[PDB]
Amino acid sequence: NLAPLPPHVPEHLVFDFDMYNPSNLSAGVQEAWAVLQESNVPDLVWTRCNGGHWIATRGQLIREAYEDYRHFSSECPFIPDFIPTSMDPPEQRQFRALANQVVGMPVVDKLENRIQELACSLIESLRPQGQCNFTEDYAEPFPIRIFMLLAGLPEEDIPHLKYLTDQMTRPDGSMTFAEAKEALYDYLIPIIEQRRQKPGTDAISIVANGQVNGRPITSDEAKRMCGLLLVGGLDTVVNFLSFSMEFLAKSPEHRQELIERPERIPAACEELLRRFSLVADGRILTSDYEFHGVQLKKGDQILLPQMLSGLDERENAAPMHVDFSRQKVSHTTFGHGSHLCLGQHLARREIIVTLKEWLTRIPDFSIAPGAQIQHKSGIVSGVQALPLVWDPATTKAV
Ligand code: HEM
């Protein structure tokens, strides 16, 4: 049900969008969100759904608000306890600098070929089967195995770790949110404590032995960081790869272009990131503030969908059209401002390696005949399942 309209909010700005259940979902997730960009919809609206909150609908406002952390705070970033997601500068800067030591560009460059080897061996074991559940069989195992590589963690721990992180996004009832969180932390603590004593060159060891505002990081702070490094690179990557593969399976022309022109693959990656953008975070007002002619009130929540900037016709012409040759690909898929994704370099490499290894070994594939692909909408929008099929005689072992 809807929350009653706060008196400071004018009726002409009220559009009852439900971010967890948009009405045109069956047409696809990005299409469903783009209803907010129809010409009768203002740049900034209020929805009475999910407790009541603002939505900025255009790239210009989304970028501005993400820049202005003094008015738009990350203390409450979700509608309706990881570090540094809930911090503003100044305190955020220290924790962000440390996490960048574990996923930064120099780390991605060294792990580059480990990343390719993991992709090749996952794809090679599927290739002869002529079918797969892509989300289940590749999109999940690939980033979780990269995390295990990054964090120096043994391979037998994958099923249990996959289970705990599935709870935070898709609970089965076994345990509450905080219970999945604590199970995750209980897993993490001993490994953190020991790598203080004999570190490796792994991510847990670096975060465990970190210094923050002059003094050593606490076990509490370390555990809450490692947690975000795990869950931060899962949900987004799993669901983004699914969107990308869904599109390519439905578009033989786009497959052929990348097969014939493998050098376009990094550009193609950027264009898929724009077209199948998937995050919608928010901020909370620190004070009363007039924003583009609209009176915002201290404590108001505002949804700032990273998804919508690149879909905005004011940023990219014919924004639903996938064109790998756009001279200017404009998006905020990895965010904007001081929280801009620390994993953005790792994510791009994961996407690029996936496109190259898959198109090289399984160049021709389709959606399983009969199947209708179902989507979900949220803070991270996604694909529920992606059944794919191909003819093993048309593949290559490499
Ligand atoms: C397609 C893949 C990805 C997408 C679309 C994505 C998107 C985003 C966005 C929009 C934010 C900022 C959220 C906000 O301002 O509230 C963010 C932050 C973050 N991401 Fe990603 N991300 C991706 C992959 C990854 C990967 C692979 C990692 C590695 C573990 C990662 C780690 C992080 C971390 C640690 C932050 C927090 C930055 C901070 O608070 O200072 N991300 N991501």
Ligand SMILES: [Cl-]
């Ligand atoms: Cl699947």
